[PDB]
Ligand binder design. Structure first.
Ligand code: CU1
Length: 105
């Protein structure tokens, strides 16, 4: 696998620690659609909207299986720790027009 999952289910935005690498989900978009991080960094998505959202990486991208993240309710968060360099495209399962990528360098 190319990422580890600190928490399989979502957690409160507030519980996100100061200085976390946050991608906001707001205005029906991933507000940083192309994020560049380094190996070992944790990325945290935070849903700011009433509509639930997730992140979904198809099979072969983060590992063998698809990573279909849990739906974050408003003001919930979800993290992935990237362990290997690459470019990792994702979308929202419910709203597949919402697309982003994490470039791990
Ligand atoms: Cu979404």
């Amino acid at each position: 696998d190319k990422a580890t999952i600190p928490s399989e289910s979502p957690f409160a935005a507030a519980e996100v620690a100061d200085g976390a690498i946050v991608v906001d989900i707001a205005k029906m978009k991933y507000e940083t659609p192309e994020l560049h991080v380094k190996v070992g960094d944790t990325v945290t998505w935070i849903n700011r909207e009433a509509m639930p959202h997730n992140v979904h990486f198809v099979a072969g991208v983060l590992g063998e299986a698809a990573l279909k993240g849990p739906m974050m309710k408003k003001e919930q968060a979800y993290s992935l720790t990237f362990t290997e360099a690459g470019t990792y495209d994702y979308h929202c399962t419910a709203h597949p027009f919402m697309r982003g990528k994490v470039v791990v360098e």
